[PDB]
Write a protein that binds this ligand. Structure first.
Ligand SMILES: Cc1cn([C@H]2C[C@H](O)[C@@H](COP(=O)(O)OP(=O)(O)OP(=O)(O)O)O2)c(=O)[nH]c1=O
Ligand SMILES: Cc1cn([C@H]2C[C@H](O)[C@@H](COP(=O)(O)OP(=O)(O)OP(=O)(O)O)O2)c(=O)[nH]c1=O
Ligand SMILES: Cc1cn([C@H]2C[C@H](O)[C@@H](COP(=O)(O)OP(=O)(O)OP(=O)(O)O)O2)c(=O)[nH]c1=O
Ligand SMILES: [Mg+2]
Ligand SMILES: [Mg+2]
Ligand SMILES: [Mg+2]
Lengths: 474, 271, 241
């Protein structure tokens, strides 16, 4: 705080470092020494300019604190003044790493250190562009941490290209490789380092193993109720978005719960339901009677009879014997956190997002379209990063003229309600239509990205006594 | 001052003029707009699921092998393994992704490595893995790789009105300074009256999402249309919408899809 | 009367040509031919008029806008014929025929360059090719250019664009460009002196018949349909019919 501390007025001494692994000759060469002020021994490093004049002290205690004695610039490097050229420099992260590298080479290669570290490296590298122009190769030697990789990624932009090489280490940095006897690896990473490879670009030649293992694993997961759906779309796949549409009360949820039953029972996949039309008391209740080929909630006489005889526990045990059903009950930020907890932690493979029109209309926004677009692209980014089968349910809008959508109207692809990016970022669109013959439902495949065949996929019938979607003939 | 006289400019004009890249399939394009040139930003437009990626992938495949120029992709929409498998299947005439029993054959026969080194044997193709960071990556590809064709697969997911105008001015300044051939895919807006774009509706230049400067800062716009719920779903119509260098616009030709192989090949059709 | 226009000879029949101190705007859509129409007036005011012309190609480079002039003066579509670009490389005789004088001055912060072209060079026709790459920043720029044109008295021709129509056909298919269709703000139809619009049926029977519309005139005042020009794809000159 006061001024540059002189070694005479602070009882200075140039000695070795036993617990770090640095002899006294390298500390005599650089200028790292120890003062005795305020009783406790304080270590101190010296900053010089390009000429060689002392500009700053840096004082560290026994409990790893920092203390600048005065004006701290950004164009001041720890270890810069000793060299004024050369063919190869090694840039470190901390300050003991410079002593570590100059210990093992007997002062033969120019080694500099940063004055801020990895937090403010871009500021001290942008102002130091002119010092690195007189050099021929630059070897960056940072930590093997997240902040170290971020600093070596973001600090190689302001430097001249073609000279910046990055080395890897099995330690944290150079000092643990100096302590643990790994003095044979750090001497090879200086002379032979890794060339340019920024994250984001991938060469087409060095991709053989990933393409080899990628066509080995997924694929499959057939549908149910009809054959033409699997004849045209070839099932549901990881990383896709299948969007099922209908009118009002046309059977857009019954088909999805039937597919959830077939995918949770016949194939053994963990299924995560996000039902927002009803509570969790109902969407786990109808599956019992649907597996037992009846209508459970739609008959009051059978409810008391299965309460009395104890058959309800038998029906609960024969269905939910495995942990294959994860329910959810009802901002748009925490819902994706729930889906990430269902995908990463518990391990779901089929995630159903029912009735999306009450997560874009229940949020307070002035403009609905940008919110729908941002939600859809963030959900697609989630489904592409994790790679999970994701079914999403949305609705239709009002026609301009003619019949209504709930009386046999053939739907078009522009009838999706809310925006026009619901069909641009979805991977399969299935529409269900019927006419109130009140049970003849037809399936229209509007868009398929995997195959190409669209149009009428088939016909089904809804059973009013059991609750299944049976295939018909017509 | 940075003014330029037209008197002391003789050698710069003489050294400048000392056709360009051609399109594969629908040979009425390179007769009408006279092929692709350096410093161009080409726009590709169609409806939802009409074959924009399918059309641009064949152009990448035919500019990566028969011309010998470096090709840089940017698949912002999907993973690089999918587009790599699609390129490998498309060059060897055999539809690979949409066949399950054929993918497991070539990994155990050992001829997959015979397919891999035939087309990726050179350092031609360079893939990208998913605002200013993407521009920095593309500028790094152009500087330290020297690629001639750069493909941007989906511009709608880049937007996370003036934010699109600034991006388009920045891409135009990049393609003007570096002189790289840039291909950009963009989408159409929701029609408010009549049929949809997927049932053969003539696409105008008005239908562009986001802003209105997508047609004021680009050099050429190619639209593709095809009747989806119709009699045949593969006969496409190609429409040139704007060309600064030639000017002649309109209907170019017709192509079919060839469901077995996947090559967009031209065919004959009167009207 | 002042400066005359070459092609569409109903303009100087209606607004009596251009005059000093004016701000001329050409408003058309994408693919209508705004740069070719202003290029022709740049060519016809540098050799037949004898006036110093200051260009500002903010949209294109300086190599294309010079080769375009060299080709257009010699009746040859130059930049699009590959065989003729290597046949003539007689090129220096074509070069010193129109660049042998000190008439044309191209351009590769902008107002300082324009004030240096007016003061230090003596240019009387300043052409600004693209304005959209530069509500406050547009109107402030228009008032600064208006104060500059009032202080100096230089003819100024600036290209701007049209907005996106919300109902009906587009501007590229025969819709008449009204006075409302201007981007940025509403001061573009209040601070200029004349507005010339070009209309041509792109997706039509013939794409090479442009109609010219006058939208405003502070001297004569009469507006409406001017005439009809053809393009002559072999040559490239907009000629009236
Ligand atoms: C498809 C179909 C449904 N139904 C009955 C079963 C159910 O009681 C009801 C539809 O079941 P739901 O799936 O609950 O209705 P929905 O999802 O279409 O409506 P919403 O948009 O509000 O979510 O109609 C028939 O009777 N015949 C049929 O063909
Ligand atoms: C071009 C074409 C594609 N197809 C089908 C089969 C192809 O595997 C599939 C590929 O279409 P895509 O290229 O994936 O469609 P897209 O990229 O334009 O749409 P998006 O914005 O969602 O990315 O389309 C046909 O059936 N007939 C055709 O003529
Ligand atoms: C006027 C006219 C131009 N053309 C052609 C010649 C040129 O290739 C092109 C000229 O149009 P441009 O002058 O380039 O149009 P623009 O400047 O308004 O738009 P932008 O630069 O953003 O694209 O059109 C014709 O074919 N017939 C015509 O009548
Ligand atoms: Mg429902
Ligand atoms: Mg695509
Ligand atoms: Mg122009």
């Amino acid at each position: 705080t006061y001024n540059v501390w002189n070694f005479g007025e602070s009882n200075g001494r140039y000695s070795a470092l036993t617990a770090r692994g640095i002899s006294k000759e390298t500390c005599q060469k650089a200028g790292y020494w120890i003062a005795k002020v305020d009783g406790v021994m304080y270590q101190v490093a010296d900053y010089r300019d390009q000429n060689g004049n002392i500009v700053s002290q840096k004082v560290r205690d026994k409990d790893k604190n920092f203390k600048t004695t005065g004006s701290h610039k950004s164009d001041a490097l720890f270890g810069k003044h000793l060299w004024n050229g050369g063919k190869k420099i090694v840039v470190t992260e901390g300050e003991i790493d410079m002593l570590t590298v100059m210990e093992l080479q007997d002062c033969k290669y120019p080694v500099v250190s940063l004055g801020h570290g990895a937090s403010a490296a871009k500021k001290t590298c942008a102002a130091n562009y002119e010092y690195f122009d007189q050099f021929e190769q630059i070897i960056l030697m940072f930590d093997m941490d997240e902040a170290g990789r971020k600093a070596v990624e973001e600090a190689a932009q302001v430097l001249p290209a073609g000279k910046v090489r990055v080395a890897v280490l099995p330690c944290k940095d150079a000092n643990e490789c100096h302590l643990n006897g790994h003095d044979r690896e750090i001497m090879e990473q200086v002379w032979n380092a890794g060339p340019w490879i920024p994250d984001g670009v991938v060469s087409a030649l060095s991709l053989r193993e990933r393409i080899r293992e990628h066509l080995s694993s997924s694929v499959g997961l057939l549908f149910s109720g009809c054959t033409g759906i699997n004849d045209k779309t070839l099932g549901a796949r990881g990383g896709e978005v299948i969007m099922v549409t209908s009118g009002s009360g046309m059977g857009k949820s019954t088909f999805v719960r039937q597919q959830a039953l077939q995918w949770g029972t016949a194939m053994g996949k963990k299924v995560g339901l996000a039902m927002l039309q009803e509570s969790v008391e109902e969407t786990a209740e109808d599956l019992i009677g649907l597996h037992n080929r009846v209508r459970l909630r739609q008959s009051d006489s059978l409810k008391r009879e299965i309460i009395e005889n104890g058959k309800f526990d038998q029906w609960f045990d024969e269905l939910f014997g495995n942990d294959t059903f994860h329910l959810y009950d009802s901002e748009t930020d925490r819902l994706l956190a729930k889906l990430a907890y269902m995908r990463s932690g518990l391990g779901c493979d089929v995630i159903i997002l029912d009735h999306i029109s009450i997560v874009v209309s229940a949020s307070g926004e002035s403009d609905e379209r940008k919110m729908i677009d941002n939600l859809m692209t963030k959900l697609k980014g989630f489904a592409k990063s994790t790679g999970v089968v994701l079914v999403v349910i949305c609705h239709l809008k009002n026609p301009d003229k003619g019949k209504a959508h709930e009386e046999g109207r053939p739907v078009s692809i522009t009838d999706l309600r809310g925006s026009g990016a619901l069909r641009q970022l979805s991977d399969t669109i299935i529409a269900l239509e019927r006419n109130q013959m009140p049970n003849l439902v037809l399936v229209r495949i509007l868009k398929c990205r995997f195959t190409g065949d669209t149009g009428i996929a088939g016909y089904m019938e809804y059973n009013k006594e059991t609750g299944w979607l049976e295939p018909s003939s017509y």
